[PDB]
Amino acid sequence: GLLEGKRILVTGIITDSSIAFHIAKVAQEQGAELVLTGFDRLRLIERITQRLPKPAPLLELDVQNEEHLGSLAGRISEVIGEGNKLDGVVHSIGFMPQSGMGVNPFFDAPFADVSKGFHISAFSYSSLAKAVLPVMNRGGSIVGMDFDPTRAMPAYNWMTVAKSALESVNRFVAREAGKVGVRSNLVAAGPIRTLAMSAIVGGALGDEAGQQMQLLEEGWDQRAPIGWDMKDPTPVAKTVCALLSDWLPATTGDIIFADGGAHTQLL
Amino acid sequence: GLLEGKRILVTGIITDSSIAFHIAKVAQEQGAELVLTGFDRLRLIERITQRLPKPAPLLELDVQNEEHLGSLAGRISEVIGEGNKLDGVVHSIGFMPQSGMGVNPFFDAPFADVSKGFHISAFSYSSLAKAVLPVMNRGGSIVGMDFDPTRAMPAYNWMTVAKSALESVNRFVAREAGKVGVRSNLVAAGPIRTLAMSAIVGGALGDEAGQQMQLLEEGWDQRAPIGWDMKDPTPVAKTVCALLSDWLPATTGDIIFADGGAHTQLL
Amino acid sequence: GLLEGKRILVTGIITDSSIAFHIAKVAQEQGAELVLTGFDRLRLIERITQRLPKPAPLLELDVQNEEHLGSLAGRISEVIGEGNKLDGVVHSIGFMPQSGMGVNPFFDAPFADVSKGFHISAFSYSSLAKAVLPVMNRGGSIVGMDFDPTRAMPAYNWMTVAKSALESVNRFVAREAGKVGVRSNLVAAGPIRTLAMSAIVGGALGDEAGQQMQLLEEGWDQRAPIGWDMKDPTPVAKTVCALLSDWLPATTGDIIFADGGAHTQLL
Amino acid sequence: GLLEGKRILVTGIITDSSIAFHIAKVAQEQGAELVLTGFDRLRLIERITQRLPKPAPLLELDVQNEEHLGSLAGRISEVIGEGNKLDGVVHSIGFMPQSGMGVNPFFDAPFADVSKGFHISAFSYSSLAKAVLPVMNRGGSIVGMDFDPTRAMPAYNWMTVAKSALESVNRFVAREAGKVGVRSNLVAAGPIRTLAMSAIVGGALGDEAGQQMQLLEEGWDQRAPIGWDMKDPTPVAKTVCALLSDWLPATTGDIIFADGGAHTQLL
Numbered sequence A, B, C, D: 001g002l003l004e005g006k007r008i009l010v011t012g013i014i015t016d017s018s019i020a021f022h023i024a025k026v027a028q029e030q031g032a033e034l035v036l037t038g039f040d041r042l043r044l045i046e047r048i049t050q051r052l053p054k055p056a057p058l059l060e061l062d063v064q065n066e067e068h069l070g071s072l073a074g075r076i077s078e079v080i081g082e083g084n085k086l087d088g089v090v091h092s093i094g095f096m097p098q099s100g101m102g103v104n105p106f107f108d109a110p111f112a113d114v115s116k117g118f119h120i121s122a123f124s125y126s127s128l129a130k131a132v133l134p135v136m137n138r139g140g141s142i143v144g145m146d147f148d149p150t151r152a153m154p155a156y157n158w159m160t161v162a163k164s165a166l167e168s169v170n171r172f173v174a175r176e177a178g179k180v181g182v183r184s185n186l187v188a189a190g191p192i193r194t195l196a197m198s199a200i201v202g203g204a205l206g207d208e209a210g211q212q213m214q215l216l217e218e219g220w221d222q223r224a225p226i227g228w229d230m231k232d233p234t235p236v237a238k239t240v241c242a243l244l245s246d247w248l249p250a251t252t253g254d255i256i257f258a259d260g261g262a263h264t265q266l267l
């Protein structure tokens, strides 16, 4: 397989619609041996991870918890063996309180909420890299998930700002990881119908945000020269696996778009 | 003059080498009537502002202080008159603790420090816009200061991340300000020899950062097709005044480079 | 005025809807003394230029004609006086045969047609600069017109490719012009209702291109935080004059957007 | 292997240092069955291609020759079998006469030379796609070679302009190819020590271009977080194969950087 024998840490599974669930599924199908992390609802997460193709141990990780981060390498070493290291790490983690993403006015998001969203969505890409690099092999690969924030848009609001920050963090992570022969890259995915995204369709964020999301999705598939299926996470998972593989060995600090080509077309 | 009769708020003066000091000087030379804001050391700041071409009132503003922000419009109205509004606002504010900018490893900056730097350097562009827009005229202009963060670099570290966030914030400020006919733009300046920058030359951040800064500055002037004089803030001040004027009336959400053209040349 | 006393060459007037007509009008209103150039239909152009604020001299210039280019500096000197020099030059020239812009398939444009369009629309920015620089003052400014080609789009086709080339040419012109103290920049304008653009509305390029143009224009005004009026060339003309002035003295090799901010917003 | 069973056309082999030679070598090692094309020196190319892992058929293709292009699909079918189709196509073709790339002044390149270089280096990406798409499978992939032209640089001159045009062409090829389920992308490679590049080191383009090339290459390896070995084309070849594979199925109209991460770092 594409990832035969590689040991890969996958963060960010919470449901079977999580992008990270599909990353993990494809990685296992491609021969990878996974370690998974979960935040908060560990019992619920294990129910989900048992439906992956193969067994994988689950470790707790709250990226705001410095004790979790400081112990993470040693906890990984306990499960993969002290003499073994990881070849890949996937950051598939994001959060922004409703005040910063949705129908609340952009100007009205309190700093404490934006700061928490920035912590989880952008700063933690650096935190995770710092925590895992001591147990990563030379030639390894760190991959995070992005949503193209080059231009402003309805509703995404401060999450857009967090993604812009994340892209900048990735370039500095690449500097540090490169010293020990590890690549760092983001995959900028088009919109994917997770459970939360289905709730937006149903008006959970507000009817206005629901209309804006539909407008975005229809235009995305239209613009994309090869189309875009929001209900199919597999192309995104495959692209992450491509970056975890040895087939893009000279790409780092970079952003690879798994978006149907939509961002290359104006209309 | 270029700004004849325009009422403009200028933040960010702390020394006579502050970029904002030169923005204020050129604006006054061009006919603008200024309101100034200062942070913390008001007595020291007034000593500086008395050396500007013309008198200007000074109001206190700590952008982390929500009481200062909430009262700012009314305090402006008290000095310019209740029936009058501002035509221009300049954000020339930045901060990052030494743990996030300098020789400290990128991975070792504590979140609390990065969060404070993000608050002052990026979030506050939105906070200031929210505070001032109620007292801004249609046709007005908000301008902030940027340092091109498209690529990573030595020492700038988390300030680079804050600038990447600032660029994203600017695009959302433009959305909001556009509703009431106000433009929002950043000026990406080349390196300017402020007092703090002279301290880096002298090794205050560390000899390694001093060498990196010299390497950056020499290359900047070399790359720039028209050269770059770090000891001359006037071209930057003029560019800010251009954006405050009525001569770029269809530019918003954007970044104008006052950098000698350096960013357009690889070497 | 903004351009008081400056001597400026303006290419590209063919009708009173030409962007160059409005550049010339605003520049004269701001005190510039113009030299105009015209291609082919010189008698028609003279009739149009008599509608400008002030009568100005007209020189013939076909940018594909090396004799016109080689004689241009001397012909300028005959108009402005021996020993006098230009302060500004405006390139407002474009062309693409119908095989390369419109409803003809992208793959079906013959090379000879694309080459001619590349010659007039991109290569000639360099040719014009070479021809005029010997009679330009230090501190001068060369400005060309762009339509953002970062993303592909319907109908614009090989003209998009020519604009991508033009942006690259501009960065090299800036290198050469900077040696003699002259800036070079492009203004990326939103869509403007010239007579030819009105013909597209009327279906002259085909009903499909008419529909695509309407879709582009409606979306442009929607996206632009300050709106976009295709029937108002004045904001574009003002922006060109800003770059011809002394108020952006550290910007070269660059692209300034006069587009309502539309390119900074996804939707 | 990564490309098991795929039928792939590879243009651009002239020496065993050609990037296309290494693309072909890796593709064969990964199970692809190749059709090769060669320009002009067919007997010399045959001698080179016999050094590949597996003997492969060679077709003549001058991309300026419309008869070669119009007959190409039928000639491919004669080689692969009537009814069979290609899965991948590699454009690894470039040319610029010495007047347009080297030490000759940018302004002094004659149009005829720039036009020829534009024809071969940019227009032909579209010509090749038009010629091959009728014999490409759905799910196929077209890949071309790029050198990042976002910023100007010494010596590359009009070849930089051709690459800027090529990137724009690629976005339009993606539009057309997407209609039949085919992706189109470019790989932006760092500098590779081909025989011609070795000649630059030896001063064949002039001592000044030799010095500029060395400065570019030393800086490239320095900037790249994972380093850059100009003498190792394999990472570039692997990246092209990644795009020819099924592992980046949602990327089109795009540019993937195989450059060590250098373009993401300022210094």
Ligand SMILES: NC(=O)c1ccc[n+]([C@@H]2O[C@H](COP(=O)([O-])OP(=O)(O)OC[C@H]3O[C@@H](n4cnc5c(N)ncnc54)[C@H](O)[C@@H]3O)[C@@H](O)[C@H]2O)c1
Pocket (backbone or CB within 6 Å): A011, A012, A013, A014, A015, A017, A018, A019, A020, A038, A039, A061, A062, A063, A064, A091, A092, A093, A094, A095, A120, A145, A146, A147, A188, A189, A190, A191, A192, A193, A194, A196, A197
């Ligand atoms: N869904 C899309 O349309 C889309 C598009 C592009 C990018 N992305 C990005 O993909 C990533 C995964 O999102 P998703 O759409 O799969 O949604 P998701 O809700 O399934 O995944 C987000 C994950 O982040 C985790 N997380 C939140 N706070 C955390 C913390 N303190 N510590 C550790 N983990 C924490 C959640 O538990 C969850 O597993 C995010 O970065 C998201 O921004 C999503």
Ligand SMILES: NC(=O)c1ccc[n+]([C@@H]2O[C@H](COP(=O)([O-])OP(=O)(O)OC[C@H]3O[C@@H](n4cnc5c(N)ncnc54)[C@H](O)[C@@H]3O)[C@@H](O)[C@H]2O)c1
Pocket (backbone or CB within 6 Å): B011, B012, B013, B014, B015, B017, B018, B019, B020, B038, B039, B061, B062, B063, B064, B091, B092, B093, B094, B095, B120, B145, B146, B147, B188, B189, B190, B191, B192, B193, B194, B196, B197
């Ligand atoms: N100096 C350069 O080389 C350079 C280059 C490009 C951009 N910039 C930007 O220009 C702007 C001005 O910086 P400068 O170089 O003139 O330095 P400076 O130190 O003179 O100005 C920074 C200002 O921010 C103010 N500030 C800090 N915390 C604040 C708070 N809580 N509330 C209000 N104001 C606060 C300081 O009091 C000071 O007046 C910053 O955004 C900086 O990032 C500087």
Ligand SMILES: NC(=O)c1ccc[n+]([C@@H]2O[C@H](COP(=O)([O-])OP(=O)(O)OC[C@H]3O[C@@H](n4cnc5c(N)ncnc54)[C@H](O)[C@@H]3O)[C@@H](O)[C@H]2O)c1
Pocket (backbone or CB within 6 Å): C011, C012, C013, C014, C015, C017, C018, C019, C020, C038, C039, C061, C062, C063, C064, C091, C092, C093, C094, C095, C120, C145, C146, C147, C188, C189, C190, C191, C192, C193, C194, C196, C197
């Ligand atoms: N109209 C828009 O929506 C729009 C938007 C953005 C940019 N632009 C650009 O603005 C510029 C001016 O276009 P416009 O819309 O005013 O249309 P226009 O037709 O009025 O101007 C184009 C000019 O190019 C001249 N020209 C053509 N071939 C020439 C040659 N061989 N030598 C000299 N001059 C030659 C024509 O005579 C004409 O004066 C062009 O670069 C165009 O691409 C136009």
Ligand SMILES: NC(=O)c1ccc[n+]([C@@H]2O[C@H](COP(=O)([O-])OP(=O)(O)OC[C@H]3O[C@@H](n4cnc5c(N)ncnc54)[C@H](O)[C@@H]3O)[C@@H](O)[C@H]2O)c1
Pocket (backbone or CB within 6 Å): D011, D012, D013, D014, D015, D017, D018, D019, D020, D038, D039, D061, D062, D063, D064, D091, D092, D093, D094, D095, D120, D145, D146, D147, D188, D189, D190, D191, D192, D193, D194, D196, D197
């Ligand atoms: N060498 C580098 O540093 C470098 C870096 C980035 C990108 N590239 C690109 O990689 C590609 C391959 O270049 P290379 O460095 O391997 O050099 P090369 O000389 O080995 O390959 C260029 C090829 O183009 C072919 N070609 C020229 N005119 C042609 C025509 N009329 N019809 C068909 N083929 C024609 C030549 O025969 C040759 O095989 C080019 O696009 C080049 O711009 C090269």
Ligand SMILES: CC1(C)CCC(Cc2cc(O)c(-c3ccccc3)c(=O)[nH]2)CC1
Pocket (backbone or CB within 6 Å): A093, A094, A095, A096, A147, A153, A154, A155, A156, A159, A190, A191, A192, A194, A196, A197, A209, A212, A213, A216
């Ligand atoms: C209305 C809107 C623009 C439609 C597209 C979506 C895409 C998207 C991005 C994104 O980062 C997320 C996300 C954010 C935080 C945590 C988990 C997931 C998402 O759900 N959806 C973002 C909102």
Ligand SMILES: CC1(C)CCC(Cc2cc(O)c(-c3ccccc3)c(=O)[nH]2)CC1
Pocket (backbone or CB within 6 Å): B093, B094, B095, B096, B147, B153, B154, B155, B156, B159, B190, B191, B192, B194, B196, B197, B209, B212, B213, B216
């Ligand atoms: C070593 C280094 C890259 C040299 C160039 C400078 C330019 C620079 C940017 C900048 O934002 C600032 C700045 C930051 C925070 C507060 C006040 C000012 C600065 O001093 N100097 C940044 C550091």
Ligand SMILES: CC1(C)CCC(Cc2cc(O)c(-c3ccccc3)c(=O)[nH]2)CC1
Pocket (backbone or CB within 6 Å): C093, C094, C095, C096, C147, C153, C154, C155, C156, C159, C190, C191, C192, C194, C196, C197, C209, C212, C213, C216
């Ligand atoms: C259908 C379409 C995308 C709508 C927008 C227009 C904008 C536009 C650009 C442009 O460069 C021109 C142009 C091109 C060549 C010569 C003179 C003018 C134009 O008319 N219109 C281009 C076509």
Ligand SMILES: CC1(C)CCC(Cc2cc(O)c(-c3ccccc3)c(=O)[nH]2)CC1
Pocket (backbone or CB within 6 Å): D093, D094, D095, D096, D147, D153, D154, D155, D156, D159, D190, D191, D192, D194, D196, D197, D209, D212, D213, D216
């Ligand atoms: C001096 C300079 C900037 C150093 C780096 C090289 C990189 C490079 C790109 C490139 O497109 C080529 C190329 C161009 C045309 C035909 C075949 C190959 C090259 O040889 N070298 C280009 C020249």
Ligand code: NA
Pocket (backbone or CB within 6 Å): A221, A222, A223, A224, A225, A226, A227, A228
């Ligand atoms: Na589509």
Ligand code: NA
Pocket (backbone or CB within 6 Å): B221, B222, B223, B224, B225, B226, B227, B228
């Ligand atoms: Na220089």
Ligand code: NA
Pocket (backbone or CB within 6 Å): C220, C221, C222, C223, C224, C225, C226, C227, C228
């Ligand atoms: Na609008």
Ligand code: NA
Pocket (backbone or CB within 6 Å): D220, D221, D222, D223, D224, D225, D226, D227, D228
């Ligand atoms: Na390096």
